[PDB]
Write a protein that binds this ligand. Structure first.
Ligand SMILES: [Zn+2]
Ligand SMILES: [Zn+2]
Ligand SMILES: [Zn+2]
Lengths: 39, 113, 42, 32, 67, 45, 263
């Protein structure tokens, strides 16, 4: 393929952002559901 | 297709005067001035300078349509003074104010640099 | 076990769209046609 | 190490002079 | 398609900060922190860089028509 | 007299209104006219 | 009587305070700096070859928006006021860009630093594209892959932002007066309490908050105006301020000349 440097950088950014989203959004949702449950 | 040329906002045609003055005979000592290729930048400045003069009893302006670059001013003064003289005094006063403002700005910029 | 969050549901939906796509019904119907229907009609 | 490895009392010393579920981090390739 | 030269709302030059933005995102900075580092304060300018999609990279993958 | 360009291998050639419309070297059936020589000007607005 | 006080000063931005001036004067100064200060920008583009993936008018529009150095643009003439044939050295600056990708792999970026000044006014500091540093590459113009070339010749002319926004020296002018709302020029929308639902201004500490037992002063007028002028690099901030003042003075003097000539 010989990918460009900008495209490879964007792919790395996308992988990091996907991992960070999958952690943080899930943790926030768990905190929200436990708070709604304890009420 | 029907869009006017953008330079028509500020370029004055050869047959179109920059300034046309007609009297307003309804009240004494009043004139109507028509400014061509001008907008709020000059109009508001002149109006609010003239409104502080003791011998100016009426001053106003209006831009009839935003698609045409012109405005019309109405000016009424006391019996002793003529409205054109008041307009000239206002122009000279704003020029002097801008001159001292520029001087002080240059002084302060040189001080702080 | 552990509870299932909304993010897990979106993971399952992502798996669905990774496998099927958005025009899978058209392609599957045409493939069924070409593979068997012409022979059966003949 | 990171903020997580910091002691909780020292984490309490970091006072602004929590993430929310509806602020995602932008992507470029998406998925599907 | 390609990063606009000026911000649409105010006209600040944002066309010289795309590669630096990608570099900062590579280093691990958050998007808001990266925009802060590039001195984009008004959200009108932040919108220009935050929502840009680089389509020219897809257009360049087709073989040139003249050689 | 008129320049062309192949749609596949981007090769330049000419035609005399009597040859078949084909690429000389790779035999593609799709060719494109070359850009004119007249002056091209834009107003940068 | 008018006073100027400078808070922060930089090449590309100045934050000042105007006092003892009318609101109309400050607003007219803001409008003049936004729309009526002349600069230099590319206006005609001759394209000799363009085999990139971008349309010709796309690249022409991008070229128009590149800020050029306009320090000596006051000594230049307007193209319509120049008696010369076609374009000369006294009303235009000629720049040339030639880019190409060598090799069969990778991509080449075309930056505004690749624009080369070929001709212009003698000994005037006009025409060169603005650059923050010596190692700065500038604005990204295009991208090229193998066998793609760009070869253009641009003509930079003098103009104002009234004709097109590419000639504007400023980006945004912050403008503000009366942070504590003593003049009651605005009526604050609220749900419970207006005081605690509205953020404080950044100049709220520069003025004394009103006393609780004070009564409304109907004789007061706006007196102190805070403004920040941000430039695109084509001119320095002090240059923009001085030339705005000069442009306003020239407009007023033209009005006065028309009045005296009317007789
Ligand atoms: Zn902006
Ligand atoms: Zn061929
Ligand atoms: Zn000339």
């Amino acid at each position: 393929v010989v990918a460009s440097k900008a495209s490879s950088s964007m792919l790395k950014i996308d992988q990091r952002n996907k991992k960070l989203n999958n952690r943080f959004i899930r943790k926030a949702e768990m905190a929200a559901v436990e708070k709604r449950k304890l009420r | 297709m029907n869009a006017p040329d953008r330079f028509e906002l500020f370029i004055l045609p050869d047959d179109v005067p920059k300034l046309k003055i007609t009297p307003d005979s309804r009240v004494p000592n009043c004139i109507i001035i028509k400014f061509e290729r001008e907008d709020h930048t000059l109009a508001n400045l002149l109006r609010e300078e003239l409104a502080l003069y003791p011998d100016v009893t009426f001053v106003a302006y209006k831009v009839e349509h935003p698609l045409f670059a012109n405005f019309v001013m109405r000016l009424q003064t006391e019996e002793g003074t003529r409205p054109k003289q008041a307009l000239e005094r206002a122009c000279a006063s704003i020029i002097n104010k801008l001159k001292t403002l520029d001087h002080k700005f240059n002084e302060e910029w040189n001080i702080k640099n | 076990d552990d509870t299932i969050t909304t993010e897990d549901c979106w993971t399952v939906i992502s798996a669905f769209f990774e496998e099927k796509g958005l025009v899978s019904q058209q392609l599957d119907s045409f493939d069924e046609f070409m593979e068997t229907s012409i022979q059966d009609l003949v | 190490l990171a903020i997580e490895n910091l002691h909780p009392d020292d984490r309490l010393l970091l006072v602004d002079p929590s993430p929310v579920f509806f602020l995602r981090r932008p992507q470029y390739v998406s998925d599907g | 398609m390609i990063i606009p030269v000026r911000c649409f709302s105010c006209g600040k030059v944002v066309g010289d900060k795309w590669d630096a933005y990608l570099r900062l995102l590579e280093e691990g900075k958050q998007e808001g922190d990266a925009l802060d580092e590039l001195k984009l304060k008004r959200y009108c300018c932040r919108r220009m860089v935050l929502t840009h999609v680089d389509l020219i990279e897809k257009f360049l993958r087709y073989n040139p028509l003249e050689k | 007299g008129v320049k062309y360009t192949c749609g596949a291998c981007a090769h330049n050639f000419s035609l005399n209104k009597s040859d078949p419309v084909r690429c000389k070297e790779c035999g593609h059936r799709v060719i494109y006219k070359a850009r004119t020589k007249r002056m091209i000007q834009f107003d940068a607005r | 009587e008018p006073k100027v006080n400078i808070i922060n000063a930089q090449d590309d931005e100045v934050e000042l305070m105007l006092s003892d001036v009318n609101l109309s004067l400050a607003n007219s100064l803001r409008r003049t700096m936004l729309a009526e200060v002349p600069t230099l920008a590319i206006d005609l583009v001759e394209i000799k070859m363009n085999t990139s993936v971008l349309a010709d008018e796309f690249i022409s529009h991008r070229l128009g928006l590149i800020p050029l150095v306009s320090e000596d643009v006051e000594e230049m003439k307007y193209s319509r006021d120049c008696t010369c044939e076609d374009y000369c050295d006294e009303c235009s600056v000629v720049l040339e860009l030639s880019a190409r990708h060598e090799g069969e792999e990778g991509t080449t970026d075309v930056y505004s630093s690749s624009l080369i000044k070929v001709s212009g006014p003698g000994n005037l500091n006009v025409g060169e594209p603005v650059r923050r540093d010596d190692y700065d590459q500038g604005i990204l113009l295009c991208k090229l892959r193998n066998h793609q070339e760009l070869n253009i010749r641009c003509i930079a002319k003098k103009g104002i932002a009234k004709e097109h926004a590419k000639w504007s020296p400023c980006s945004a002018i912050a403008f503000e007066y009366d942070p504590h709302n003593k003049l009651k020029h605005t009526d604050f929308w609220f749900e419970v309490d207006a005081k605690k639902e509205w953020p404080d201004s950044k100049y709220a500490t520069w003025e004394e908050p009103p006393k609780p037992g004070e009564v409304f002063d109907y004789k007061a007028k706006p007196n102190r105006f805070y403004m920040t002028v941000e430039t695109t690099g084509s001119l320095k901030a002090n240059q923009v301020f001085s030339r705005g003042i000069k442009t306003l003075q020239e407009k007023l003097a033209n009005v006065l000349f028309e009045l005296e000539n009317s007789r």
